[PDB]
Amino acid sequence: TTCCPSIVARSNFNVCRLPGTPEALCATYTGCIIIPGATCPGDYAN
């Protein structure tokens, strides 16, 4: 679903959305993709 390059980007995503910032905003700012599928390979599952 929401899957980032590295965990650093995910935590960045978390901190970004901490005050309730739009997911698309933070996802784009970090580099995290929001896909309908929950399956993310370990290659990009961070």
DSSP one-letter string for 4-45: -SSHHHHHHHHHHTTT---HHHHHHHHT-EE-S-----TTT-
How far apart CA 16 and CA 31 sit, in angstroms, is: 12
Alpha-carbon distance of 13 to 2, in angstroms, equals: 10
User: And the tokens for 21?
Assistant: 């910032």
The amino acid at 18: L
Instruction: Name which of 1, 19, 5, 41 is nearest 30 in CA terms.
Output: 5
Those residues with Cβ within 8 angstroms of residue 37's Cβ, 6 or more apart along the chain or in another chain: 1
Element (H, E) at 16: helix 7-16
**Sign, Cα dihedral of 14, 19, 23, 28:** negative
Rounded Cα gap, residues 29 and 18, in angstroms = 14
Q: How far apart are CA 35 and CA 3, in angstroms?
A: 8
Give me the domains of the chain, ranges plus CATH numbers: 1-46 (3.30.1350.10)
CB 12 within 8 A of CB 35: no
19 alpha carbon, distance to own chain's centre:
16
